[PDB]
Amino acid sequence: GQLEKPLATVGGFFKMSVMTGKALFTRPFQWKEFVLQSWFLIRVAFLPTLAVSIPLTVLIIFTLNILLAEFGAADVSGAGAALGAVTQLGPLVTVLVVAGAGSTAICADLGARTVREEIDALEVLGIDPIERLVVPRVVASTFVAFMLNGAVITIGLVGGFFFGVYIQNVSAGAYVSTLTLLTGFPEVLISVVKATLFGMIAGLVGCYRGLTVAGGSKGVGTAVNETLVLCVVALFAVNVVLTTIGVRFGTGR
Amino acid sequence: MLLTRFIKMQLVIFLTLTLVALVVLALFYLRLPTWAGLGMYKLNADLPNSGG
């Protein structure tokens, strides 16, 4: 009985996601809502994404450079600079600035629609919310996560190059020539898969929590907080699983 | 005022977790007695060169 309580919400989320997939592959797509939600997520989670990605990659590059300079092998730093940035820094900054901003925004928007009885207004008009609202939001979440992951990886690599060369006086040719030493097609492919899955899961969780808001006076805030916590936990677990799968393939081996 | 004995229960379990975590981290992971010098005596040496 103790496990049966969260299992009901788990089943509701899973059934809602199954219906979302069915509406995506069966019913006509909502291009207008998809465009609107894509631009909304981009405008709500682009500047924070850079503002979190730039200092974090600078910190990682600084730590790697000092540790390797003491180690003596300061010419292979770019290798690590690539290896983290493609496979962990990109998807994890995507996790943070998607779950914090876009997932919470989707949950708040759908909760606002629910408490204002707009969902019931759609439902009494014969329309299905899962096809008109959830599908464009999940697709927009996936698209924005993909693009943001690409931008994060690129900006992180460039910032690491500039910091290491112009501050810690490492050699630029060693940075650019060692980037591909440990990173190849498997790493960028697993990064793309991570970003796509993270965006899809964040969109699904945000939509499901927004549709099932409790109203009241703290229901929307509680729903947003629960959305954020669930997204962080689920995306970290999925990142662990996908990291294991990706290192099973490997560029070095 | 207050003292609902459920907040008290949360407080005492949190304090137990705090003490356990602090002691385990200080002893088995950080080795604070070794860093401070508990149970150790000082010894010196003179070398012709450091040798790194």
Partner: protein
């Protein structure tokens, strides 16, 4: 410190040692023309405790 050649794997941030213990670090390396011959000049930043 002047020398015939700087030496490979000698870059700014290299440790300067006395009797094997670090006392400072290398600041910069340059090429100086002495009697129509290039030589290496190294600038060292040393803690004045050991001077």
């Amino acid at each position: 410190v002047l020398s015939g050649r700087a030496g490979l794997s000698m870059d700014p941030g290299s440790k300067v040692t006395f009797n094997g213990v670090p006392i400072g670090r290398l600041a910069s390396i340059d090429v100086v023309e002495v009697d129509d011959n290039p030589e290496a000049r190294l600038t060292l930043d040393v803690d004045p405790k050991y001077l």
